[PDB]
CSV table of N, CA and C and ligand atoms in Angstrom, one decimal:
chain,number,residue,atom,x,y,z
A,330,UNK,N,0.8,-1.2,0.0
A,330,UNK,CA,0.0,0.0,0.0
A,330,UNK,C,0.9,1.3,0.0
A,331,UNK,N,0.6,2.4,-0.5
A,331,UNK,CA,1.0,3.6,-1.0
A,331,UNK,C,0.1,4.4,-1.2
A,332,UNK,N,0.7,5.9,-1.1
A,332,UNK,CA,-0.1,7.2,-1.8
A,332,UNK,C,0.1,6.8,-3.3
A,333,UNK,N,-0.8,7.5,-4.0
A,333,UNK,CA,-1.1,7.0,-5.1
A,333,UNK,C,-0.8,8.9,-5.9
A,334,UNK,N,0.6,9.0,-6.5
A,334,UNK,CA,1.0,10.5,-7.1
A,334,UNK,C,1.4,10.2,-8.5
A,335,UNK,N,0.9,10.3,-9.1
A,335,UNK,CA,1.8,10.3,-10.7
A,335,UNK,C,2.4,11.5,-11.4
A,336,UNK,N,3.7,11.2,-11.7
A,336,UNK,CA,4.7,12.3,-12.5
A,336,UNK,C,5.2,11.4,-13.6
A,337,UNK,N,4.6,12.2,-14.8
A,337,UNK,CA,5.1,11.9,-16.5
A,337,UNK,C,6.2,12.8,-16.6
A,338,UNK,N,7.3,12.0,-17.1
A,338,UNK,CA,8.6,12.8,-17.2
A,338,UNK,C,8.9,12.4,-18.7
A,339,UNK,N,8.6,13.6,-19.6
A,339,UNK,CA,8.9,13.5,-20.8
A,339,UNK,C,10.3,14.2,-20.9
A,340,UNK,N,11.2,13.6,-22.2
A,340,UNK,CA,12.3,13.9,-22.6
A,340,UNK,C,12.2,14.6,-23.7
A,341,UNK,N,12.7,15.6,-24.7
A,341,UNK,CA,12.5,16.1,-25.5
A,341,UNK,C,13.8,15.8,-26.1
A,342,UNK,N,14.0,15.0,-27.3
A,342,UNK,CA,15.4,15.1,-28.0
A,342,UNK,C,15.2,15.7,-29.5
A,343,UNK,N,16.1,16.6,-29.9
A,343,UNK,CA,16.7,17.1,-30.7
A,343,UNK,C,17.3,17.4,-31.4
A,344,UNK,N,17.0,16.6,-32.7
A,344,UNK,CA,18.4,15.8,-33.5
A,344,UNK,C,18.6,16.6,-34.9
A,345,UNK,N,20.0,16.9,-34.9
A,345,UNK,CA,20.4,17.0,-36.1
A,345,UNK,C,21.3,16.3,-37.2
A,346,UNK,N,20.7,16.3,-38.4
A,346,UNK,CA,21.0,15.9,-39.7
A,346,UNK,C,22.1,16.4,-40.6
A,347,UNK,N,23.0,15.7,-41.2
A,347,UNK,CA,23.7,16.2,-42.3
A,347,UNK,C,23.3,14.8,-43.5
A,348,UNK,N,24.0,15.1,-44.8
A,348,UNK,CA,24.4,14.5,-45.4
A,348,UNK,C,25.9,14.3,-46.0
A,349,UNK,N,26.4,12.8,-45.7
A,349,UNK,CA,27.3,12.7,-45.7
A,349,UNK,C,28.4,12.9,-47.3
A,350,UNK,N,29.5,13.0,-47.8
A,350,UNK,CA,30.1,12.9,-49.2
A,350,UNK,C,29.8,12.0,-50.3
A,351,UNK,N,29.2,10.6,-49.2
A,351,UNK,CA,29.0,9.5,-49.4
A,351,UNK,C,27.2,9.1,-49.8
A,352,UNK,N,26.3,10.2,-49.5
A,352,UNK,CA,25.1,10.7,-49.4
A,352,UNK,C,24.5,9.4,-48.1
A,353,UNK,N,25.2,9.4,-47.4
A,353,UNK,CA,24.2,8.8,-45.9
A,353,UNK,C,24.6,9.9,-45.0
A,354,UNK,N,23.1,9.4,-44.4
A,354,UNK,CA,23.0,10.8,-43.3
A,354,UNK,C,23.5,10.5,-42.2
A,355,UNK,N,23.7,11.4,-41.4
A,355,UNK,CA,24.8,11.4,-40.4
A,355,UNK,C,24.5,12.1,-39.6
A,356,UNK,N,23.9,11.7,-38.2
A,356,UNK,CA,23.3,12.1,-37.1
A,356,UNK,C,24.3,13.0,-36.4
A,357,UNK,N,24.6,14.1,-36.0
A,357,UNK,CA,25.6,15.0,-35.3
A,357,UNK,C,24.9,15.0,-33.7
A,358,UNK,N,26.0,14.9,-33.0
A,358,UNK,CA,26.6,14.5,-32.1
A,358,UNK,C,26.1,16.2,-31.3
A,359,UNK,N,25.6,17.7,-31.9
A,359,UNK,CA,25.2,18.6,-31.8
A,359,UNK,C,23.6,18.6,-31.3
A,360,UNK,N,23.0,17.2,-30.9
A,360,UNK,CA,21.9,16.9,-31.0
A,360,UNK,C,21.2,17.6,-29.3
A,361,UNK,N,20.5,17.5,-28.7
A,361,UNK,CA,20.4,17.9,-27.5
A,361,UNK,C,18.7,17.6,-26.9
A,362,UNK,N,19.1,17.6,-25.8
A,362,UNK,CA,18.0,16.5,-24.7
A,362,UNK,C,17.5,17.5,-23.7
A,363,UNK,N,16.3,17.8,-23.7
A,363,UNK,CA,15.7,18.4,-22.5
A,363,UNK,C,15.0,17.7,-21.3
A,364,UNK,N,15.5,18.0,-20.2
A,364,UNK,CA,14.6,17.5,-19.1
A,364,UNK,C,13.3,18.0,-18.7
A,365,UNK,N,12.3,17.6,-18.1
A,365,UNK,CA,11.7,18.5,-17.4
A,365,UNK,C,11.9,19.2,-16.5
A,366,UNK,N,11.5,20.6,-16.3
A,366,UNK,CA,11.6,21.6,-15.2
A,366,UNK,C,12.0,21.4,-14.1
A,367,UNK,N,13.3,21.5,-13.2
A,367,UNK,CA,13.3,20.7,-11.6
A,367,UNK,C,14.3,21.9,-10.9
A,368,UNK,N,13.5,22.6,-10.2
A,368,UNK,CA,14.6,23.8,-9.4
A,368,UNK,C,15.5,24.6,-10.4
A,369,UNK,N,14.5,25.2,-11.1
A,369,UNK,CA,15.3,26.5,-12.2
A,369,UNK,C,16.1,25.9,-13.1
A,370,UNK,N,16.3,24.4,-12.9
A,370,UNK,CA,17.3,23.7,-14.0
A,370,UNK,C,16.5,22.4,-14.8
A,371,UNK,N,17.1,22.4,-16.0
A,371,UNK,CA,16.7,21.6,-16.8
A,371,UNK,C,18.0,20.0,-17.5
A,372,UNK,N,18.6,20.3,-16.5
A,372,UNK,CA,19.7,18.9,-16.9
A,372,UNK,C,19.7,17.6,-16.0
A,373,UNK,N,19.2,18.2,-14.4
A,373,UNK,CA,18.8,16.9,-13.2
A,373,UNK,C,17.3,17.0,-12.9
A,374,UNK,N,16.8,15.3,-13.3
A,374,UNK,CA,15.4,15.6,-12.6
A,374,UNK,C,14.9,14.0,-11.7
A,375,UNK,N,14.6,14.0,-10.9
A,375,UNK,CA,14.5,13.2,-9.6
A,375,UNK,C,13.2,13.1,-9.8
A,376,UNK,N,12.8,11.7,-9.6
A,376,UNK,CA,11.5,11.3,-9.2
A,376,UNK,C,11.0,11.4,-7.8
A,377,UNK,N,9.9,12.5,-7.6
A,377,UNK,CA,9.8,13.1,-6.3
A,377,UNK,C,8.4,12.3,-6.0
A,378,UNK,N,7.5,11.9,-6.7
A,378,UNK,CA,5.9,11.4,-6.3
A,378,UNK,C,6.5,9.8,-6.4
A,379,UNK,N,5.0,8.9,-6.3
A,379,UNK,CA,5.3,7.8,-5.9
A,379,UNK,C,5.0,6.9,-7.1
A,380,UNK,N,4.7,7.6,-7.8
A,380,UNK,CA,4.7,6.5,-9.4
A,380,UNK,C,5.1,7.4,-10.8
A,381,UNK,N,5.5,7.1,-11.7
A,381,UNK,CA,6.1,7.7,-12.7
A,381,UNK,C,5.6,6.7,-14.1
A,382,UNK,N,5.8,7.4,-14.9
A,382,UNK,CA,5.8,7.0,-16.4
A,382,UNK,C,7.1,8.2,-17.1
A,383,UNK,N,7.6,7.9,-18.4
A,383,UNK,CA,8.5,8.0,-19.1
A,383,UNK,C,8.3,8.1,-20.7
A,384,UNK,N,8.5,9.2,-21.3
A,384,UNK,CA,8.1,9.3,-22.5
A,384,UNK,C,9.1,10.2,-23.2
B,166,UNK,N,3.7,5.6,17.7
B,166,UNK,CA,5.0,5.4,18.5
B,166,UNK,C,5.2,7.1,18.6
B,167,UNK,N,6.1,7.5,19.0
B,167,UNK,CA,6.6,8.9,18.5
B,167,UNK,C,8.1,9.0,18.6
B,168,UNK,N,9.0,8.9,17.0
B,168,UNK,CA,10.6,8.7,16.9
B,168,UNK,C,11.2,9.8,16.9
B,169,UNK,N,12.6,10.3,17.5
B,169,UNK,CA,13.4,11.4,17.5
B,169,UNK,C,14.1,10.2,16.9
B,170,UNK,N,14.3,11.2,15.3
B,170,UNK,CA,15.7,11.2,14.8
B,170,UNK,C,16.7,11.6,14.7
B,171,UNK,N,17.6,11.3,14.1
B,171,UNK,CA,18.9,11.8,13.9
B,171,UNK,C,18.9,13.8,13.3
B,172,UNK,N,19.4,14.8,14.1
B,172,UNK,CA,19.4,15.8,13.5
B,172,UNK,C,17.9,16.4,13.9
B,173,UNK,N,17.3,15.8,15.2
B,173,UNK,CA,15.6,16.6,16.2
B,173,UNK,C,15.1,16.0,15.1
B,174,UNK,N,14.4,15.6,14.1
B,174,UNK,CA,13.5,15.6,13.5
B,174,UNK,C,12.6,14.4,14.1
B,175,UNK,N,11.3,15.1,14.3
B,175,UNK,CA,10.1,14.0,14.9
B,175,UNK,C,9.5,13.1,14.1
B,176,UNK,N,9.3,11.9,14.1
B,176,UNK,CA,8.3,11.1,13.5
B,176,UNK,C,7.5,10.5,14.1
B,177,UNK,N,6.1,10.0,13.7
B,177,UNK,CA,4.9,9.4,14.4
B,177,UNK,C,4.7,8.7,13.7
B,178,UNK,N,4.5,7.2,14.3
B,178,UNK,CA,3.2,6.2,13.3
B,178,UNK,C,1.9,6.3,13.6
B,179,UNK,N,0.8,6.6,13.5
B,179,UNK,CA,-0.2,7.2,13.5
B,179,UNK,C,-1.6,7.0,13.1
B,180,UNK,N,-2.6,5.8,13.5
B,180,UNK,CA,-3.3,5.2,13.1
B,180,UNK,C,-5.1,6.3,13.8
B,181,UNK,N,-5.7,6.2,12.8
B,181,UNK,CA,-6.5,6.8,13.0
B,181,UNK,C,-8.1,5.5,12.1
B,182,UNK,N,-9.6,6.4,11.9
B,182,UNK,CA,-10.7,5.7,11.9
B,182,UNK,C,-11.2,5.8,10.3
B,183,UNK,N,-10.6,7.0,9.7
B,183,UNK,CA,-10.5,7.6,8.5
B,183,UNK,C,-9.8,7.3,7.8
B,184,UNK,N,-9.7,7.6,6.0
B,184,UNK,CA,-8.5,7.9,5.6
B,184,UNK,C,-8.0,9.3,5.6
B,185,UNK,N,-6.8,9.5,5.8
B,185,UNK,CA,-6.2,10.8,5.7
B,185,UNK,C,-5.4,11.1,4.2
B,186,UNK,N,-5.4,12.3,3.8
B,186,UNK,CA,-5.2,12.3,2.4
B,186,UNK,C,-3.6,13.0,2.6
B,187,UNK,N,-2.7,12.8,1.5
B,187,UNK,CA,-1.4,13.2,1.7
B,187,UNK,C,-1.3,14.4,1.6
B,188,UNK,N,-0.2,14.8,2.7
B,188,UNK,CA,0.3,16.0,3.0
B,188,UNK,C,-0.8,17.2,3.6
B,189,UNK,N,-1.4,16.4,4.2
B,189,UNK,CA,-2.9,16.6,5.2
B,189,UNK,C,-3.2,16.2,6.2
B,190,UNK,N,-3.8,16.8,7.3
B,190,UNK,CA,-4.1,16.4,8.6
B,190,UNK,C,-5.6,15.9,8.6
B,191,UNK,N,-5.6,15.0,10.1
B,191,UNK,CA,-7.0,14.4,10.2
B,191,UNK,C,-7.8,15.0,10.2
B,204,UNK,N,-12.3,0.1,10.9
B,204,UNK,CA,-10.8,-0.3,10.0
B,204,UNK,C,-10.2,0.5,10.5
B,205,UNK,N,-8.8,0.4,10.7
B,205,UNK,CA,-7.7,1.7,11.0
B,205,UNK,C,-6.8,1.7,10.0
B,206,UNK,N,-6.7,3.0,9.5
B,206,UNK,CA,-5.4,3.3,8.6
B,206,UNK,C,-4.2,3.4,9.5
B,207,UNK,N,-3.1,3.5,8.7
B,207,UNK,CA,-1.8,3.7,9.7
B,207,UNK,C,-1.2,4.4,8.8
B,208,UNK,N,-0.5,5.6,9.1
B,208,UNK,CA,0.0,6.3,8.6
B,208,UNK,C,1.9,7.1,9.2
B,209,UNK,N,2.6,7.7,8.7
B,209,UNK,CA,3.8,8.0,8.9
B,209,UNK,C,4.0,9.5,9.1
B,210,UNK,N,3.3,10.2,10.0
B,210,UNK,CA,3.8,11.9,10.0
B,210,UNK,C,4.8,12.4,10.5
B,211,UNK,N,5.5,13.3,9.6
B,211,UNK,CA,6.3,14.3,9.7
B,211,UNK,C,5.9,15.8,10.9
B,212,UNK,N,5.0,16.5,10.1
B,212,UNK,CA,5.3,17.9,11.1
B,212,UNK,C,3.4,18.1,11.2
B,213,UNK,N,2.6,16.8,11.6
B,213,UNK,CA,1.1,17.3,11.0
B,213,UNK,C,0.7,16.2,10.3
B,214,UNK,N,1.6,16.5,9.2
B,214,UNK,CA,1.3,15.8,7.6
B,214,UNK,C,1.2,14.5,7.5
B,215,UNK,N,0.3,13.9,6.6
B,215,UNK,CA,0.8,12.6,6.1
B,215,UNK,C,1.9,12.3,5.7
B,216,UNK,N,3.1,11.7,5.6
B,216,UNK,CA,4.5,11.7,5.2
B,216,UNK,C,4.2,10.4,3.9
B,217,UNK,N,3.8,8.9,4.4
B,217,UNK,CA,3.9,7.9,3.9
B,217,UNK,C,2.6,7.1,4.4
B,218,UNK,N,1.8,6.4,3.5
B,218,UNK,CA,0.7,5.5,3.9
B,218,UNK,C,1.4,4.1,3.7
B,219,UNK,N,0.9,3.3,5.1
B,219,UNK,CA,1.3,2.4,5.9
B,219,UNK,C,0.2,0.8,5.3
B,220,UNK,N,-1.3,1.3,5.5
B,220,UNK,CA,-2.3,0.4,5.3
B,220,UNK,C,-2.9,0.5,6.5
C,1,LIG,C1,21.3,22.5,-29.6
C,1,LIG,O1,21.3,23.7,-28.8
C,1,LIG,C2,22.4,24.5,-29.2
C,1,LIG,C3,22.5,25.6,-28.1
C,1,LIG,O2,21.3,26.4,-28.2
C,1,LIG,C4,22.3,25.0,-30.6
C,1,LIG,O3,23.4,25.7,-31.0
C,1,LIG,C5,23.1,27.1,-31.4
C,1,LIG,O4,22.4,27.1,-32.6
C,1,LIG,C6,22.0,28.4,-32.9
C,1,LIG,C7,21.1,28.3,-34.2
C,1,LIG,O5,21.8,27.9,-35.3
C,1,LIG,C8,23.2,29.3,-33.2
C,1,LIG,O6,22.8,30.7,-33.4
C,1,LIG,C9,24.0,29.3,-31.9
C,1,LIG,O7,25.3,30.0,-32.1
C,1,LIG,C10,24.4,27.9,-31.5
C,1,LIG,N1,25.1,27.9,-30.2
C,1,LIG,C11,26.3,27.3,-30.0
C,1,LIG,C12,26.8,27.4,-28.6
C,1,LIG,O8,26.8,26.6,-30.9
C,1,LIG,C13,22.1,23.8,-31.5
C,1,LIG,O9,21.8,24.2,-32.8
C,1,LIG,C14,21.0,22.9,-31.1
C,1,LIG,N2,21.0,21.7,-31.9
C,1,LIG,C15,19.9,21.2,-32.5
C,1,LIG,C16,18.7,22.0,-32.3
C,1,LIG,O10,20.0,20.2,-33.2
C,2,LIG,C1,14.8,14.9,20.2
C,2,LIG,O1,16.2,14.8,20.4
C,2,LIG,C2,16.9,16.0,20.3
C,2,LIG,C3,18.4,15.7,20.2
C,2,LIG,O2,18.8,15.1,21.4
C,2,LIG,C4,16.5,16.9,21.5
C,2,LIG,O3,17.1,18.2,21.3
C,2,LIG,C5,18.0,18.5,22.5
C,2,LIG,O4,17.2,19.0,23.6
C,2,LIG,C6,18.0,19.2,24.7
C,2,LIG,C7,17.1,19.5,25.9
C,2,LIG,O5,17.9,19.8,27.0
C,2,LIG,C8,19.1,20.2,24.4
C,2,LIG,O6,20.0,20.3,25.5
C,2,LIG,C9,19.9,19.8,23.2
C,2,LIG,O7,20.8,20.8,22.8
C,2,LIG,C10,19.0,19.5,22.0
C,2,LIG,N1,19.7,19.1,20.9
C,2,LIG,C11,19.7,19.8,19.7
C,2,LIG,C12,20.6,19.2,18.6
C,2,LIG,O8,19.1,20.8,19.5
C,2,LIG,C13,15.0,17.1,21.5
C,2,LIG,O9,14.6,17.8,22.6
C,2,LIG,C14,14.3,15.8,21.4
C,2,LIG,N2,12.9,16.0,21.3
C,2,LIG,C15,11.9,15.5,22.1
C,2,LIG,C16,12.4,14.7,23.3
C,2,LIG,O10,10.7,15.7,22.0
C,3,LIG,C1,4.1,14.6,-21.3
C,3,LIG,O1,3.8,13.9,-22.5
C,3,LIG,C2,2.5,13.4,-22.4
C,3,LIG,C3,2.3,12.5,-23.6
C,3,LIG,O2,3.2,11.4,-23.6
C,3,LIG,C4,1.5,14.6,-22.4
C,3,LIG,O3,0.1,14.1,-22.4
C,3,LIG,C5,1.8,15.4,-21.2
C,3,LIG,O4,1.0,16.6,-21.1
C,3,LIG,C6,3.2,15.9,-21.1
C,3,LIG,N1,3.5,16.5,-19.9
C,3,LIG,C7,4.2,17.7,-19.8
C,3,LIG,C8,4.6,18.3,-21.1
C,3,LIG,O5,4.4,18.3,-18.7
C,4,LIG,C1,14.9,30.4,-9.5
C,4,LIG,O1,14.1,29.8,-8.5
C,4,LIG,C2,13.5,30.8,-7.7
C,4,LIG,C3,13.0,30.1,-6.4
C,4,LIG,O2,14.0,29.5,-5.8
C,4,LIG,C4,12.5,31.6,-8.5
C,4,LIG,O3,11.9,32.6,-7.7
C,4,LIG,C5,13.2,32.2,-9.7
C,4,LIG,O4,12.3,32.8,-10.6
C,4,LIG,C6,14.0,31.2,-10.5
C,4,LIG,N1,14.8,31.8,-11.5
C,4,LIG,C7,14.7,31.5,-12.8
C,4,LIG,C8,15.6,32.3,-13.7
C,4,LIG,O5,14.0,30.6,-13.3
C,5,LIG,C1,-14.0,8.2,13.3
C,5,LIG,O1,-14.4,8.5,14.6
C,5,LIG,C2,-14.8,9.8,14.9
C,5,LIG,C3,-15.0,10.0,16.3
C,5,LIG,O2,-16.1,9.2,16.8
C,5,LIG,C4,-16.1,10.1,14.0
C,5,LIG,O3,-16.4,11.5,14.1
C,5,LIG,C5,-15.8,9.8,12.6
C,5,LIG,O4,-17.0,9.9,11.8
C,5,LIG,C6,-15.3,8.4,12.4
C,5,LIG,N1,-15.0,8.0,11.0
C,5,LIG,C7,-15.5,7.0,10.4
C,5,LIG,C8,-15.1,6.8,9.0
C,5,LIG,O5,-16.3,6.2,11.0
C,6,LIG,C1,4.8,22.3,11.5
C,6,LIG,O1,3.4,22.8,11.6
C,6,LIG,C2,3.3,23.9,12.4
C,6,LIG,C3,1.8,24.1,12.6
C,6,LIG,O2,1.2,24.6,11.4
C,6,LIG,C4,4.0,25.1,11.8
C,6,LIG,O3,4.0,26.2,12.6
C,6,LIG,C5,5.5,24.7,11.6
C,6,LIG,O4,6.2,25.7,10.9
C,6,LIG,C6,5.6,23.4,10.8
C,6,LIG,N1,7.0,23.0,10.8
C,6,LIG,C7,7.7,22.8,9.6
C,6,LIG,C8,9.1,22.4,9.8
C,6,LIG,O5,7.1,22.9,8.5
Protein backbone atom coordinates (compact mmCIF):
# COMPACT_ATOMS: atom_id res chain seq x y z
CA UNK A 1 0.00 0.00 0.00
CA UNK A 2 1.01 3.58 -0.95
CA UNK A 3 -0.12 7.17 -1.81
CA UNK A 4 -1.06 7.05 -5.13
CA UNK A 5 0.95 10.51 -7.09
CA UNK A 6 1.84 10.26 -10.67
CA UNK A 7 4.65 12.27 -12.45
CA UNK A 8 5.12 11.92 -16.53
CA UNK A 9 8.59 12.78 -17.19
CA UNK A 10 8.95 13.47 -20.84
CA UNK A 11 12.31 13.88 -22.65
CA UNK A 12 12.52 16.13 -25.49
CA UNK A 13 15.39 15.12 -27.97
CA UNK A 14 16.71 17.14 -30.70
CA UNK A 15 18.39 15.77 -33.46
CA UNK A 16 20.41 17.02 -36.08
CA UNK A 17 21.00 15.93 -39.66
CA UNK A 18 23.68 16.24 -42.29
CA UNK A 19 24.39 14.48 -45.35
CA UNK A 20 27.31 12.70 -45.70
CA UNK A 21 30.12 12.90 -49.19
CA UNK A 22 28.99 9.51 -49.41
CA UNK A 23 25.13 10.74 -49.37
CA UNK A 24 24.22 8.82 -45.91
CA UNK A 25 22.98 10.79 -43.35
CA UNK A 26 24.78 11.36 -40.43
CA UNK A 27 23.31 12.08 -37.14
CA UNK A 28 25.61 15.02 -35.26
CA UNK A 29 26.61 14.51 -32.09
CA UNK A 30 25.16 18.55 -31.79
CA UNK A 31 21.90 16.89 -30.95
CA UNK A 32 20.39 17.93 -27.53
CA UNK A 33 18.04 16.53 -24.70
CA UNK A 34 15.74 18.38 -22.47
CA UNK A 35 14.60 17.55 -19.10
CA UNK A 36 11.66 18.47 -17.45
CA UNK A 37 11.62 21.65 -15.23
CA UNK A 38 13.25 20.73 -11.57
CA UNK A 39 14.64 23.82 -9.40
CA UNK A 40 15.26 26.46 -12.17
CA UNK A 41 17.26 23.69 -13.98
CA UNK A 42 16.73 21.60 -16.81
CA UNK A 43 19.66 18.85 -16.92
CA UNK A 44 18.82 16.87 -13.18
CA UNK A 45 15.40 15.60 -12.61
CA UNK A 46 14.52 13.19 -9.56
CA UNK A 47 11.48 11.32 -9.24
CA UNK A 48 9.82 13.10 -6.30
CA UNK A 49 5.91 11.43 -6.30
CA UNK A 50 5.27 7.79 -5.88
CA UNK A 51 4.66 6.52 -9.42
CA UNK A 52 6.05 7.67 -12.74
CA UNK A 53 5.77 7.04 -16.43
CA UNK A 54 8.48 7.99 -19.07
CA UNK A 55 8.14 9.29 -22.47
CA UNK B 1 4.98 5.38 18.53
CA UNK B 2 6.58 8.90 18.51
CA UNK B 3 10.59 8.69 16.92
CA UNK B 4 13.37 11.44 17.52
CA UNK B 5 15.66 11.23 14.84
CA UNK B 6 18.91 11.85 13.94
CA UNK B 7 19.37 15.78 13.51
CA UNK B 8 15.56 16.59 16.25
CA UNK B 9 13.48 15.65 13.48
CA UNK B 10 10.13 13.96 14.92
CA UNK B 11 8.25 11.11 13.47
CA UNK B 12 4.85 9.39 14.39
CA UNK B 13 3.20 6.18 13.29
CA UNK B 14 -0.22 7.24 13.54
CA UNK B 15 -3.30 5.19 13.12
CA UNK B 16 -6.54 6.80 12.99
CA UNK B 17 -10.70 5.69 11.93
CA UNK B 18 -10.51 7.64 8.50
CA UNK B 19 -8.54 7.93 5.61
CA UNK B 20 -6.19 10.85 5.74
CA UNK B 21 -5.16 12.32 2.39
CA UNK B 22 -1.38 13.18 1.68
CA UNK B 23 0.32 15.95 3.00
CA UNK B 24 -2.88 16.64 5.20
CA UNK B 25 -4.12 16.43 8.62
CA UNK B 26 -7.03 14.41 10.16
CA UNK B 27 -10.80 -0.27 9.96
CA UNK B 28 -7.73 1.70 10.96
CA UNK B 29 -5.45 3.33 8.59
CA UNK B 30 -1.85 3.67 9.68
CA UNK B 31 0.01 6.34 8.56
CA UNK B 32 3.78 7.99 8.93
CA UNK B 33 3.75 11.89 10.01
CA UNK B 34 6.30 14.29 9.68
CA UNK B 35 5.25 17.87 11.09
CA UNK B 36 1.15 17.27 11.00
CA UNK B 37 1.27 15.83 7.58
CA UNK B 38 0.80 12.56 6.14
CA UNK B 39 4.45 11.66 5.21
CA UNK B 40 3.85 7.93 3.91
CA UNK B 41 0.68 5.54 3.88
CA UNK B 42 1.35 2.38 5.89
CA UNK B 43 -2.35 0.44 5.33
C1 LIG C 1 21.28 22.52 -29.59
O1 LIG C 1 21.31 23.71 -28.83
C2 LIG C 1 22.42 24.53 -29.15
C3 LIG C 1 22.48 25.64 -28.13
O2 LIG C 1 21.31 26.42 -28.22
C4 LIG C 1 22.28 25.02 -30.60
O3 LIG C 1 23.43 25.72 -31.02
C5 LIG C 1 23.07 27.08 -31.37
O4 LIG C 1 22.39 27.14 -32.60
C6 LIG C 1 21.96 28.44 -32.95
C7 LIG C 1 21.06 28.35 -34.15
O5 LIG C 1 21.80 27.92 -35.27
C8 LIG C 1 23.20 29.32 -33.17
O6 LIG C 1 22.84 30.66 -33.44
C9 LIG C 1 24.05 29.32 -31.91
O7 LIG C 1 25.26 29.99 -32.09
C10 LIG C 1 24.37 27.89 -31.48
N1 LIG C 1 25.08 27.88 -30.23
C11 LIG C 1 26.26 27.26 -30.04
C12 LIG C 1 26.82 27.38 -28.64
O8 LIG C 1 26.84 26.63 -30.91
C13 LIG C 1 22.11 23.83 -31.54
O9 LIG C 1 21.77 24.24 -32.84
C14 LIG C 1 21.03 22.87 -31.06
N2 LIG C 1 21.00 21.68 -31.85
C15 LIG C 1 19.93 21.19 -32.49
C16 LIG C 1 18.65 21.98 -32.35
O10 LIG C 1 19.96 20.16 -33.16
C1 LIG D 1 14.82 14.95 20.23
O1 LIG D 1 16.21 14.80 20.39
C2 LIG D 1 16.91 16.02 20.29
C3 LIG D 1 18.39 15.71 20.19
O2 LIG D 1 18.82 15.07 21.37
C4 LIG D 1 16.52 16.92 21.47
O3 LIG D 1 17.08 18.21 21.34
C5 LIG D 1 17.95 18.47 22.46
O4 LIG D 1 17.24 18.97 23.57
C6 LIG D 1 18.04 19.15 24.72
C7 LIG D 1 17.14 19.53 25.88
O5 LIG D 1 17.92 19.83 27.01
C8 LIG D 1 19.13 20.19 24.44
O6 LIG D 1 20.04 20.29 25.51
C9 LIG D 1 19.93 19.78 23.21
O7 LIG D 1 20.84 20.78 22.81
C10 LIG D 1 18.99 19.52 22.04
N1 LIG D 1 19.72 19.10 20.88
C11 LIG D 1 19.72 19.77 19.71
C12 LIG D 1 20.56 19.15 18.62
O8 LIG D 1 19.09 20.80 19.53
C13 LIG D 1 15.00 17.10 21.49
O9 LIG D 1 14.57 17.76 22.65
C14 LIG D 1 14.28 15.76 21.41
N2 LIG D 1 12.86 15.97 21.27
C15 LIG D 1 11.92 15.48 22.10
C16 LIG D 1 12.43 14.65 23.26
O10 LIG D 1 10.72 15.68 21.95
C1 LIG E 1 4.14 14.64 -21.31
O1 LIG E 1 3.78 13.91 -22.46
C2 LIG E 1 2.47 13.40 -22.43
C3 LIG E 1 2.28 12.46 -23.61
O2 LIG E 1 3.24 11.44 -23.57
C4 LIG E 1 1.49 14.57 -22.42
O3 LIG E 1 0.15 14.14 -22.36
C5 LIG E 1 1.75 15.41 -21.17
O4 LIG E 1 0.95 16.56 -21.12
C6 LIG E 1 3.21 15.85 -21.14
N1 LIG E 1 3.52 16.53 -19.91
C7 LIG E 1 4.16 17.71 -19.81
C8 LIG E 1 4.58 18.34 -21.11
O5 LIG E 1 4.40 18.25 -18.74
C1 LIG F 1 14.88 30.38 -9.53
O1 LIG F 1 14.12 29.83 -8.48
C2 LIG F 1 13.53 30.82 -7.66
C3 LIG F 1 12.98 30.15 -6.43
O2 LIG F 1 14.01 29.47 -5.76
C4 LIG F 1 12.49 31.59 -8.49
O3 LIG F 1 11.91 32.63 -7.74
C5 LIG F 1 13.18 32.22 -9.69
O4 LIG F 1 12.26 32.81 -10.57
C6 LIG F 1 13.97 31.18 -10.48
N1 LIG F 1 14.75 31.82 -11.50
C7 LIG F 1 14.70 31.50 -12.81
C8 LIG F 1 15.61 32.32 -13.70
O5 LIG F 1 13.98 30.63 -13.27
C1 LIG G 1 -14.04 8.23 13.28
O1 LIG G 1 -14.40 8.47 14.62
C2 LIG G 1 -14.81 9.81 14.85
C3 LIG G 1 -14.99 10.00 16.35
O2 LIG G 1 -16.06 9.20 16.80
C4 LIG G 1 -16.07 10.10 14.03
O3 LIG G 1 -16.44 11.46 14.12
C5 LIG G 1 -15.83 9.79 12.56
O4 LIG G 1 -16.99 9.91 11.79
C6 LIG G 1 -15.30 8.36 12.42
N1 LIG G 1 -15.04 8.03 11.05
C7 LIG G 1 -15.55 6.95 10.42
C8 LIG G 1 -15.13 6.79 8.98
O5 LIG G 1 -16.30 6.15 10.96
C1 LIG H 1 4.75 22.31 11.48
O1 LIG H 1 3.42 22.76 11.57
C2 LIG H 1 3.26 23.89 12.41
C3 LIG H 1 1.78 24.13 12.61
O2 LIG H 1 1.21 24.60 11.41
C4 LIG H 1 4.00 25.07 11.79
O3 LIG H 1 3.96 26.21 12.63
C5 LIG H 1 5.47 24.71 11.60
O4 LIG H 1 6.17 25.70 10.90
C6 LIG H 1 5.61 23.41 10.83
N1 LIG H 1 6.99 23.01 10.76
C7 LIG H 1 7.66 22.78 9.61
C8 LIG H 1 9.10 22.37 9.78
O5 LIG H 1 7.15 22.88 8.50
Amino acid sequence: PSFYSHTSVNITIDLGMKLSGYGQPIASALSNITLPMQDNNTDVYCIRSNQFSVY
Amino acid sequence: FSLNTTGGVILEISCYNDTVRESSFYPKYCYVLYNGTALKYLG
